[PDB]
Each structure stands twice: as structure tokens, then as C-alpha cells.
CSV table of N, CA and C in Angstrom, one decimal:
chain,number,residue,atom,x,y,z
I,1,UNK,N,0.0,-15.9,-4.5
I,1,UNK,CA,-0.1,-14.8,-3.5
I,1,UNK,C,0.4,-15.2,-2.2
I,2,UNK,N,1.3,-14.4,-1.7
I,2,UNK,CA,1.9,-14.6,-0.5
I,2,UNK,C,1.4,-14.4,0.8
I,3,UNK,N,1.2,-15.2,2.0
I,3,UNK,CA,0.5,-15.0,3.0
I,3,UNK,C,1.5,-14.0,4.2
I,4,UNK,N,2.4,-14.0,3.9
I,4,UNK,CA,3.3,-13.0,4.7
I,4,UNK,C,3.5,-11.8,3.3
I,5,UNK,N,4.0,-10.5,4.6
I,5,UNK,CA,4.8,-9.3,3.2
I,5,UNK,C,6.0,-9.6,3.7
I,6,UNK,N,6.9,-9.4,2.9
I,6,UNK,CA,8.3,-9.4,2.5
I,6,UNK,C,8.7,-8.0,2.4
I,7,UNK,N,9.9,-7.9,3.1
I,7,UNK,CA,10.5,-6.6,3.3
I,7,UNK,C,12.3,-7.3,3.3
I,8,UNK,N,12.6,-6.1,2.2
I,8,UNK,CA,14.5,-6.7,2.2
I,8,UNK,C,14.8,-4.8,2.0
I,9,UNK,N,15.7,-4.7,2.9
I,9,UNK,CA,16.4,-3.5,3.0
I,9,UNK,C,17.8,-3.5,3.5
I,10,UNK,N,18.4,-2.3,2.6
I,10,UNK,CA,19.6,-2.2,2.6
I,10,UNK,C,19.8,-0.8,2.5
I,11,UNK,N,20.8,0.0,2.7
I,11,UNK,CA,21.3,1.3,3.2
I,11,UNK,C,22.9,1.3,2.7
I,12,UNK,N,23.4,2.1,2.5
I,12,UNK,CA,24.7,3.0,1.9
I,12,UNK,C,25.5,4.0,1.9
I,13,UNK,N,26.6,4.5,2.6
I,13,UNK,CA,26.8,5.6,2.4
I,13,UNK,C,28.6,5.6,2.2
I,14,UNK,N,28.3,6.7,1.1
I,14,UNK,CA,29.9,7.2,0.8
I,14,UNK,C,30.8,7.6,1.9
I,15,UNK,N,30.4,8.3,3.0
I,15,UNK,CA,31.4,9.3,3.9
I,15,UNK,C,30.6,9.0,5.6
I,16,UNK,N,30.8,10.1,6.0
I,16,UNK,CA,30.3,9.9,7.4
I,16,UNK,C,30.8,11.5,8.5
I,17,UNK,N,29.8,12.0,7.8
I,17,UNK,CA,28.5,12.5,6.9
I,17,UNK,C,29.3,12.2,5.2
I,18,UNK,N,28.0,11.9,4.7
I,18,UNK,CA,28.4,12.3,3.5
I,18,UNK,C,26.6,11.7,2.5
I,19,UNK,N,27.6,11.6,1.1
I,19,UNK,CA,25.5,11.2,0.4
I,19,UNK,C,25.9,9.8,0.5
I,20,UNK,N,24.6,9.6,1.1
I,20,UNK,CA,23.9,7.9,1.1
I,20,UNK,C,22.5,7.5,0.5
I,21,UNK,N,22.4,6.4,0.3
I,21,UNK,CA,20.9,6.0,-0.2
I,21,UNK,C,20.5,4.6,0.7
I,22,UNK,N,19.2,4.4,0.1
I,22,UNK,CA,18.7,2.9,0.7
I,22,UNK,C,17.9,2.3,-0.1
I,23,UNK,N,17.5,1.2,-0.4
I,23,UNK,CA,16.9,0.5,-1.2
I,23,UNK,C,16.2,-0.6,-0.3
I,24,UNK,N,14.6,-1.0,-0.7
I,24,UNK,CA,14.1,-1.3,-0.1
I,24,UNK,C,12.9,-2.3,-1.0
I,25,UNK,N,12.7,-3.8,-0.7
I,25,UNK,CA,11.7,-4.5,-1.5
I,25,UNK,C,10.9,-4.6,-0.8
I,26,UNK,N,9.6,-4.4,-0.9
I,26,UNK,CA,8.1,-4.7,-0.2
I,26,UNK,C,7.4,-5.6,-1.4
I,27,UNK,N,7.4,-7.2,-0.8
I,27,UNK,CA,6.0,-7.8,-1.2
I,27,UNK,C,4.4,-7.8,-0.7
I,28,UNK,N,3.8,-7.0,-1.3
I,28,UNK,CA,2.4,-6.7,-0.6
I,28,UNK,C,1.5,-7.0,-1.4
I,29,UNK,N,0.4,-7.1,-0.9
I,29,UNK,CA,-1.0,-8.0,-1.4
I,29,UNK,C,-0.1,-9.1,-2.7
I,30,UNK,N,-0.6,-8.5,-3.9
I,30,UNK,CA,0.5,-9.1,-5.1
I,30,UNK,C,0.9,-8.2,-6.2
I,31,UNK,N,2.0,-7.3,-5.1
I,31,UNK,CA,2.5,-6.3,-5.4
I,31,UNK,C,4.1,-6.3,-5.0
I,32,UNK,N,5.3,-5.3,-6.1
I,32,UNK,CA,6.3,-5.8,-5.7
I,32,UNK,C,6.4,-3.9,-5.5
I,33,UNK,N,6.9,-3.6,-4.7
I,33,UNK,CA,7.5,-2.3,-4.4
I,33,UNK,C,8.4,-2.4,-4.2
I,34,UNK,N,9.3,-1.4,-5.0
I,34,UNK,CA,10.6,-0.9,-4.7
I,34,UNK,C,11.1,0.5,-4.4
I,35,UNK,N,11.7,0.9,-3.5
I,35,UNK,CA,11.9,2.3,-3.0
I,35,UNK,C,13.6,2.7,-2.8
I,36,UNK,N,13.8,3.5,-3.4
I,36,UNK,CA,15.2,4.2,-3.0
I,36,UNK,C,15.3,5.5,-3.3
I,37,UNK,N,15.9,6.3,-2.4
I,37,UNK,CA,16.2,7.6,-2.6
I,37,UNK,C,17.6,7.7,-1.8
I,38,UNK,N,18.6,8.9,-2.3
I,38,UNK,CA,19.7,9.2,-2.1
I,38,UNK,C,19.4,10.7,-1.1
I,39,UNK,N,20.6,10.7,-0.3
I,39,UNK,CA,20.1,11.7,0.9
I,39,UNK,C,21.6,12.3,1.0
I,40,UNK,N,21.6,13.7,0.6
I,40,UNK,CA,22.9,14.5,0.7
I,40,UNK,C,24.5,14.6,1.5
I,41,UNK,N,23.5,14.3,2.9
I,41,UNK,CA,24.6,14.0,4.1
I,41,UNK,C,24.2,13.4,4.9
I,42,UNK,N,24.4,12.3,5.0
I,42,UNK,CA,23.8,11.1,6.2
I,42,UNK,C,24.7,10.0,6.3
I,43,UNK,N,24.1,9.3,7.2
I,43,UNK,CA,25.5,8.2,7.6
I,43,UNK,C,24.3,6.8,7.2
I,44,UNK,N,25.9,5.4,7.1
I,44,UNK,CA,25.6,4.4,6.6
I,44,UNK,C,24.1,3.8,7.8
I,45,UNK,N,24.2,3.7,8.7
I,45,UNK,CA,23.5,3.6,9.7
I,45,UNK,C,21.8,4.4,10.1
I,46,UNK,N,21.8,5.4,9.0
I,46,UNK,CA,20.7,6.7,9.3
I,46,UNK,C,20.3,5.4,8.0
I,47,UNK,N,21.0,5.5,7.3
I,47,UNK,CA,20.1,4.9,5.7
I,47,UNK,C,20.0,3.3,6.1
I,48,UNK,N,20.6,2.7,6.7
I,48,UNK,CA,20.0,1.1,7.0
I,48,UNK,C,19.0,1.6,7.9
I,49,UNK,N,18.5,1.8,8.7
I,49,UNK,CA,17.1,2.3,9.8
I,49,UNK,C,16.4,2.9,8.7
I,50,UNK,N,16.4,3.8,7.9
I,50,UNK,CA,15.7,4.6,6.8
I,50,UNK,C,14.8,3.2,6.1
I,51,UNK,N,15.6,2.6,5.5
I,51,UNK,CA,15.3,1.2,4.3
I,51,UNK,C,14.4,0.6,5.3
I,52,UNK,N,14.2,0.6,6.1
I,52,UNK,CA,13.0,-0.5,7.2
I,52,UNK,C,11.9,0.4,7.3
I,53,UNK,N,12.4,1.6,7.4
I,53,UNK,CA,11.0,2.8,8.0
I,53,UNK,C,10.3,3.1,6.7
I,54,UNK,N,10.6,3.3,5.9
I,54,UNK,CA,9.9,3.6,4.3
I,54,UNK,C,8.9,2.4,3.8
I,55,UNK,N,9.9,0.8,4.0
I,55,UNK,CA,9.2,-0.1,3.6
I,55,UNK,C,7.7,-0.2,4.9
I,56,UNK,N,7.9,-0.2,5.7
I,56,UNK,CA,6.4,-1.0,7.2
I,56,UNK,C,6.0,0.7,7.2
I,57,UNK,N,6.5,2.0,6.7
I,57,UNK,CA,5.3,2.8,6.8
I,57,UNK,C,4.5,2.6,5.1
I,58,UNK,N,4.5,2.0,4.3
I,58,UNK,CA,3.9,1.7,3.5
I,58,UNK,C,2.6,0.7,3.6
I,59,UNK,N,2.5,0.1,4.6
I,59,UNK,CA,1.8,-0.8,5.3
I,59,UNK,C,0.5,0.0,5.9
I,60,UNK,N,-0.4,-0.3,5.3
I,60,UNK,CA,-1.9,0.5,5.4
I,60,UNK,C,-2.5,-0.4,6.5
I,61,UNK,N,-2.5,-1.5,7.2
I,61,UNK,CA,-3.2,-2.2,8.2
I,61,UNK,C,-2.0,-3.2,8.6
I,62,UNK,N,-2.4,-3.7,9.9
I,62,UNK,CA,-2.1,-4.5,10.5
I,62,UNK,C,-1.3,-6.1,9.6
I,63,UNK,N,-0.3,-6.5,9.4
I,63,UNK,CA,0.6,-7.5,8.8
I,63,UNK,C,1.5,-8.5,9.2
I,64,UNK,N,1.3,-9.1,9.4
I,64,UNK,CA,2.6,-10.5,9.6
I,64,UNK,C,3.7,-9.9,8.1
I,65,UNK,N,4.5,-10.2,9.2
I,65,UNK,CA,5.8,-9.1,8.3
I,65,UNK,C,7.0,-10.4,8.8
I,66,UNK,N,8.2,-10.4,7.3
I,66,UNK,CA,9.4,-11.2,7.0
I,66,UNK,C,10.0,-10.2,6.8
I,67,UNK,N,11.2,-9.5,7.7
I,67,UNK,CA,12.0,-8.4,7.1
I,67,UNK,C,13.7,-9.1,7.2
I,68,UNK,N,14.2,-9.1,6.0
I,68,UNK,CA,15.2,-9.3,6.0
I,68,UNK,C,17.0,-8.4,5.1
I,69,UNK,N,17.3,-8.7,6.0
I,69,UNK,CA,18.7,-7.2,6.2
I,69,UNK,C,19.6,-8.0,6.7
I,70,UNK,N,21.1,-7.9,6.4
I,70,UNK,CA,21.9,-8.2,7.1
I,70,UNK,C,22.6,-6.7,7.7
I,71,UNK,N,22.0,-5.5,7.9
I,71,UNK,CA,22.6,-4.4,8.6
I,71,UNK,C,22.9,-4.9,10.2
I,72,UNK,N,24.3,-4.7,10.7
I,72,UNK,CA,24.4,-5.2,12.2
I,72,UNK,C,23.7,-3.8,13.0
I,73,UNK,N,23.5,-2.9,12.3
I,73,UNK,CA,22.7,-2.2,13.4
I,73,UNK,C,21.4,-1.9,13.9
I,74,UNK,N,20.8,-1.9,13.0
I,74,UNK,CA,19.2,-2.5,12.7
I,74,UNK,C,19.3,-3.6,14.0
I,75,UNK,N,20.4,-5.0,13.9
I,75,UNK,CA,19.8,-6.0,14.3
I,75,UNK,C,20.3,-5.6,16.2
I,76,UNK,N,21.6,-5.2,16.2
I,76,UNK,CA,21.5,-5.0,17.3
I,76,UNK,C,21.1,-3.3,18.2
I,77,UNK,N,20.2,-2.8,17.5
I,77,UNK,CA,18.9,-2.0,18.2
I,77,UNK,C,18.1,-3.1,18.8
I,78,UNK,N,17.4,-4.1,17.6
I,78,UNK,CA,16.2,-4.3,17.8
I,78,UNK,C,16.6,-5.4,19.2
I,79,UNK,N,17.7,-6.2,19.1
I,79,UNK,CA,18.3,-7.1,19.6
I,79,UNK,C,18.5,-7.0,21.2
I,80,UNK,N,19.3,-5.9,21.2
I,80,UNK,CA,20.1,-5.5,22.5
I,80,UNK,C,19.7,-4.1,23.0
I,81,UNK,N,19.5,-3.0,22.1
I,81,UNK,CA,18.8,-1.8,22.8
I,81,UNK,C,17.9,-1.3,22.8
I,82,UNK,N,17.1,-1.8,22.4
I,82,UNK,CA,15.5,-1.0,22.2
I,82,UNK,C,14.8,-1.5,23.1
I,83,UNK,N,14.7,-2.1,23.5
I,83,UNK,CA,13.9,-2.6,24.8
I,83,UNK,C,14.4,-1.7,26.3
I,84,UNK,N,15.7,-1.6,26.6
I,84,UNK,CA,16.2,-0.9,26.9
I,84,UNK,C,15.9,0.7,27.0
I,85,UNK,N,15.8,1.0,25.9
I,85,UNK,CA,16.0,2.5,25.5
I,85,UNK,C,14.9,3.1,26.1
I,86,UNK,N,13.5,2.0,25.7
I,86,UNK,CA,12.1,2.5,26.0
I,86,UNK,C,11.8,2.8,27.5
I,87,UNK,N,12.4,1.7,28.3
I,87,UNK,CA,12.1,2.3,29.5
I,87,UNK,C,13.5,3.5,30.1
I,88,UNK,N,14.2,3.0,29.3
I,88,UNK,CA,14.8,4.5,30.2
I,88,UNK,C,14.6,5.7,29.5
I,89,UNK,N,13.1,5.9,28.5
I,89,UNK,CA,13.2,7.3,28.4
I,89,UNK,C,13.9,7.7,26.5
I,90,UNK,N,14.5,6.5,26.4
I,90,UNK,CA,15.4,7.3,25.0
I,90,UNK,C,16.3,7.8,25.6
I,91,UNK,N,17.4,7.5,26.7
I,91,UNK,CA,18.5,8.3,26.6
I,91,UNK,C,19.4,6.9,26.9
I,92,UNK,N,20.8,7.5,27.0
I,92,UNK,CA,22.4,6.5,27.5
I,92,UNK,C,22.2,6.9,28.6
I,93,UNK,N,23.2,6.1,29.0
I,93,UNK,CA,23.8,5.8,30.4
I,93,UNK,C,23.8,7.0,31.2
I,94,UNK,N,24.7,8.2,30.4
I,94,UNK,CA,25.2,9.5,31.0
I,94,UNK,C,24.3,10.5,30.6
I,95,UNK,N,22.8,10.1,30.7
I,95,UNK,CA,21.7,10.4,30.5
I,95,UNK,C,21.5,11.8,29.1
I,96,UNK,N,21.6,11.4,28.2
I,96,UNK,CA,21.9,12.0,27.0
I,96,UNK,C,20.4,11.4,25.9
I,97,UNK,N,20.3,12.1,25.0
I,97,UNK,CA,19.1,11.9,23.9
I,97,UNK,C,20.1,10.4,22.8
I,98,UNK,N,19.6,9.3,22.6
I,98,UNK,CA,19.9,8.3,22.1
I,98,UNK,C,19.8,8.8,20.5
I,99,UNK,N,21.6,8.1,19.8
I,99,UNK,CA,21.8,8.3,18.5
I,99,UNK,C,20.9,8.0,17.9
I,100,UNK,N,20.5,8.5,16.5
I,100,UNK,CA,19.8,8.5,15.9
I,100,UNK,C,18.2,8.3,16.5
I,101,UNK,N,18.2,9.0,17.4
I,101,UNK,CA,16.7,8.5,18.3
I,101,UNK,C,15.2,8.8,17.3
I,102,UNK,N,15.7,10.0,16.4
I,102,UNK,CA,14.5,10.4,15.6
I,102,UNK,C,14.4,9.4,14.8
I,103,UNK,N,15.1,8.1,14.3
I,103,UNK,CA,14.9,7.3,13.5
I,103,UNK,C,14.3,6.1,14.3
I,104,UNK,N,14.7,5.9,15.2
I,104,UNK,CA,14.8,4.3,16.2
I,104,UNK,C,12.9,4.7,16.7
I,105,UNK,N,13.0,5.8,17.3
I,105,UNK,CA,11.5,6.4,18.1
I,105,UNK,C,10.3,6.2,16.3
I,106,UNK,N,10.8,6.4,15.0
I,106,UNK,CA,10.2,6.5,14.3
I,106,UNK,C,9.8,4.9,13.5
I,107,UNK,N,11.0,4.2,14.0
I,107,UNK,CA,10.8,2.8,13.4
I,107,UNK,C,10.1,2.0,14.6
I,108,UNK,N,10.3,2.3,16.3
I,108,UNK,CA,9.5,1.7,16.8
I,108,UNK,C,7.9,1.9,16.4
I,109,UNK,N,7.5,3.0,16.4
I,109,UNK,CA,6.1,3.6,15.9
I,109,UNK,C,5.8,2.2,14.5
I,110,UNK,N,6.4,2.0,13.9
I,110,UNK,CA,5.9,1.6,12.7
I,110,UNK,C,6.0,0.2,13.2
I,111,UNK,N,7.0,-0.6,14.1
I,111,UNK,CA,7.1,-2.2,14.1
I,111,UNK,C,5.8,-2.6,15.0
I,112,UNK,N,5.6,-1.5,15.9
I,112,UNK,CA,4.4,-1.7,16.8
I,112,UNK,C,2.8,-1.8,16.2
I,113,UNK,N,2.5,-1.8,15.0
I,113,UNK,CA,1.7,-1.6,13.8
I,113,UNK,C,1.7,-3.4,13.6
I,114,UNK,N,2.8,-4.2,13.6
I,114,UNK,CA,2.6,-5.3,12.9
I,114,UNK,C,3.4,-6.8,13.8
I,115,UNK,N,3.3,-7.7,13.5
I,115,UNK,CA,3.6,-8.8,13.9
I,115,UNK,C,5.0,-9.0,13.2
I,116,UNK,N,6.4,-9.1,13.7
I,116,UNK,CA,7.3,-9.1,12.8
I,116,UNK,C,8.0,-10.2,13.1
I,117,UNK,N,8.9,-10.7,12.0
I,117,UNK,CA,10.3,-12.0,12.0
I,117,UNK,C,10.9,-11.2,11.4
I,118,UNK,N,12.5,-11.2,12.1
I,118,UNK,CA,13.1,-10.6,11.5
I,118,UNK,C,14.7,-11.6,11.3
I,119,UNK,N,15.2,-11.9,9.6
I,119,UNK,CA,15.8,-12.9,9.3
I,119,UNK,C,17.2,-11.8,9.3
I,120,UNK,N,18.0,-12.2,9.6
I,120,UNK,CA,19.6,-11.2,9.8
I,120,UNK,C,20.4,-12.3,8.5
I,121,UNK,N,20.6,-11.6,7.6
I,121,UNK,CA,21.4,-11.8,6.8
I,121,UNK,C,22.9,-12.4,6.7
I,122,UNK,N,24.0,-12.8,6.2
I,122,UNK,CA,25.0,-12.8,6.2
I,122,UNK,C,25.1,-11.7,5.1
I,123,UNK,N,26.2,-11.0,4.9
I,123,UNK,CA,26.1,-9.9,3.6
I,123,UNK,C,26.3,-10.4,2.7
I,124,UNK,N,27.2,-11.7,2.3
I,124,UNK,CA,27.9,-12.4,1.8
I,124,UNK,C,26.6,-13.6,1.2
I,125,UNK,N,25.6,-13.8,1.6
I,125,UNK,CA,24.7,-15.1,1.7
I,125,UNK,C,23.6,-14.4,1.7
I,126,UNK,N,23.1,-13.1,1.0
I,126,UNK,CA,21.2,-12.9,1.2
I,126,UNK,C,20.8,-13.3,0.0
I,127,UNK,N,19.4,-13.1,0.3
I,127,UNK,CA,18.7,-13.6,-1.3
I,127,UNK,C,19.3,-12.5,-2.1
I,128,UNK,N,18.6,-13.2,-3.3
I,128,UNK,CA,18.9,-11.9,-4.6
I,128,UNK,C,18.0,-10.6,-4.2
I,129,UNK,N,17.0,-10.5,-3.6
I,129,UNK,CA,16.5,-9.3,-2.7
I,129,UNK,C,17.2,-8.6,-2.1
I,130,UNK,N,17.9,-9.1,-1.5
I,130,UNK,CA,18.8,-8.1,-0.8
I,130,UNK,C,20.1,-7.5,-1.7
I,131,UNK,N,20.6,-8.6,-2.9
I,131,UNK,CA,21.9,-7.6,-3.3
I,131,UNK,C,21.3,-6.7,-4.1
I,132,UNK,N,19.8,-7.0,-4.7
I,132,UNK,CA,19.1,-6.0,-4.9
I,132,UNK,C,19.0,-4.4,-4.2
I,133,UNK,N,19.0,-4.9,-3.2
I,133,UNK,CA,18.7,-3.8,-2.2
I,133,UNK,C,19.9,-2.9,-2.4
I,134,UNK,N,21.4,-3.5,-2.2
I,134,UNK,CA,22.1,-3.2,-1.8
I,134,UNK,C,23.1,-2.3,-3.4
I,135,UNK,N,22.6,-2.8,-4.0
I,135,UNK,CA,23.2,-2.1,-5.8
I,135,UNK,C,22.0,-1.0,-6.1
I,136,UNK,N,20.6,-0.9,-5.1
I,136,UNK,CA,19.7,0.6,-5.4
I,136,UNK,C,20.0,1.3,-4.7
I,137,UNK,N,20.1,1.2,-3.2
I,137,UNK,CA,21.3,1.6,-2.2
I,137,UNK,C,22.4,2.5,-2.5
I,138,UNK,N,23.0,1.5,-3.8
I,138,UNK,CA,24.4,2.6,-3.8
I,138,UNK,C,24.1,2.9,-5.0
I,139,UNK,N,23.0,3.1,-6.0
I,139,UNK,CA,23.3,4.2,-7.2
I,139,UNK,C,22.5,5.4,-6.5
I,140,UNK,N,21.4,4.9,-5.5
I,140,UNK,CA,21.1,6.1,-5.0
I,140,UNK,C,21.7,7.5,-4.2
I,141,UNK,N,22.6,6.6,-3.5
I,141,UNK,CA,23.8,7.4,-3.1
I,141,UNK,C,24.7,8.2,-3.8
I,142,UNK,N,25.0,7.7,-5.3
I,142,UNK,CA,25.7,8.7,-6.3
I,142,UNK,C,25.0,9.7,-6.5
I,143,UNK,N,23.7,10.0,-6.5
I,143,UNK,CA,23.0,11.0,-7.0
I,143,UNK,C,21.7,11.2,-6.1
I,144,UNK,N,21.9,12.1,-4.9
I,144,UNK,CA,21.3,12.6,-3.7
I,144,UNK,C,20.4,13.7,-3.9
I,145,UNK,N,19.2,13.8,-3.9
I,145,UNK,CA,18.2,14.5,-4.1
I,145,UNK,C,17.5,14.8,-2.5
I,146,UNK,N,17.6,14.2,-1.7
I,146,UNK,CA,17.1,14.7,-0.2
I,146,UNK,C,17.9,15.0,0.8
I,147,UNK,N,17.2,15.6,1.8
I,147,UNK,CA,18.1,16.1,2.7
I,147,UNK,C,17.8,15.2,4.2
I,148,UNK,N,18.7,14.7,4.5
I,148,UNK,CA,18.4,14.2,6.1
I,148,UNK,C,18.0,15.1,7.1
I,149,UNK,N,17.1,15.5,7.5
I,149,UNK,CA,16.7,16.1,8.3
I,149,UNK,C,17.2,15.9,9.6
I,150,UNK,N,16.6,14.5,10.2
I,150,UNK,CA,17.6,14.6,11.6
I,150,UNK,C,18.8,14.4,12.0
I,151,UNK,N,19.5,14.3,10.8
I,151,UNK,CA,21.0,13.7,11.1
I,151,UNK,C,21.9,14.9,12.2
I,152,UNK,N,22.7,14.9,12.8
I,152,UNK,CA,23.5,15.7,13.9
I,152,UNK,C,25.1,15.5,13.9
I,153,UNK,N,25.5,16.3,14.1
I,153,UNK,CA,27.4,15.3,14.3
I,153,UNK,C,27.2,15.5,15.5
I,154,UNK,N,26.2,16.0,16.7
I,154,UNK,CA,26.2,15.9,17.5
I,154,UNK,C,25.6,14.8,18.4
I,155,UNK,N,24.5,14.8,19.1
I,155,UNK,CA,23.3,14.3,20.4
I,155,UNK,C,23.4,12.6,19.4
């Protein structure tokens, strides 16, 4: 039995809009969860943010959390703009509502829940978790049963 949970997520998409999926492993109590669903029109980036927020809103109490992804955008939100974002409000520079903000505002909610490490992958070099991730990811994506709700070509 593992003293940390384990989180490996990956994300996918055909087009831009187009159907994407995500795939996601959660090690909990001594439990192995796996999650993927395919999403009609969404972008590769809605579904890497998606694969993190499905796995840590599964998380019923407070956790020391290992989340590992090599998505470059996941790492540089958490990295370079979200610290940022929060105090200015959620917007850019030219004072505008921040991409994907329904996702980033919904994944801060969930990291603020838990104590996190977060391991950045090479794509090339992750565990077998992750290419896991990344082969449920994309059959999910061939066959799209949900609808992205917040996605925009716009804000």
C-alpha cells in the first residue's frame, strides 16, 4: 500500500476543435482507477487540463499527491501562469477572460484540496502509466460521447 496517490494523465485530440479524449491513472487507498472519456469538439490542451481535473476531483479528503504528465501546458500554467492569473483577476494583459479559464479556475479548486509534486515527463521517457494514458486518450478520442461544454473559438 502506497503512502502517496499517484496520478498519470494524458489528453488527445484529432483537430482543433475537433473529438479528443483523456486518460487518466489514480492510485488510491489500494485502488487502481482508470478514467477516459472522448469529448466531440475540444482541443488537445482542454483534454490535457481535463485528465488532471477528473483524476484530484476523485479525491474524497485531503492527499499528498505524485501527478505525472509530460503535457507542456498543464506544466507551464502551473509553472509560469497561474500564480499570475490569480492575482490579476483571471484575465491577460489586454484585460480579457484567460483561455480555457473554466478549466484552469476548476483545476485550481481541486489542487488547493491537496499537497502536490508534480513530475513533468519527457513524452519520449514516462512510465508505462503514462503511455497508458496516452493509448486511452486516443481510442477515446475515436469514439466521442461528450460534449465540451466550455470550450469557445473565442475568449
Amino acid at each position: 500500500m502506497l503512502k502517496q496517490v499517484e496520478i498519470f494523465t494524458d489528453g488527445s485530440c484529432l483537430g482543433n476543435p475537433g473529438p479528443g479524449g483523456y486518460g487518466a491513472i489514480l492510485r488510491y487507498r489500494g485502488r487502481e482507477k482508470t478514467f477516459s472519456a472522448g469529448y466531440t469538439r475540444t482541443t488537445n490542451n482542454r483534454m490535457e487540463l481535463m485528465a488532471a481535473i477528473v483524476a484530484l476531483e476523485a479525491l474524497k479528503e485531503h492527499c499528498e499527491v505524485i501527478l505525472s504528465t509530460d503535457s507542456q501546458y498543464v506544466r507551464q500554467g502551473i509553472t509560469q501562469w497561474i500564480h499570475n492569473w490569480k492575482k490579476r483577476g483571471w484575465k491577460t494583459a489586454d484585460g480579457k477572460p484567460v483561455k480555457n479559464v473554466d478549466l484552469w479556475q476548476r483545476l485550481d479548486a481541486a489542487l488547493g484540496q491537496h499537497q502536490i509534486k508534480w513530475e513533468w515527463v519527457k513524452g519520449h521517457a514516462g512510465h508505462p502509466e503514462n503511455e497508458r494514458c496516452d493509448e486511452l486518450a486516443r481510442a477515446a478520442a475515436m469514439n466521442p460521447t461528450l460534449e465540451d461544454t466550455g470550450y469557445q473559438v473565442e475568449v
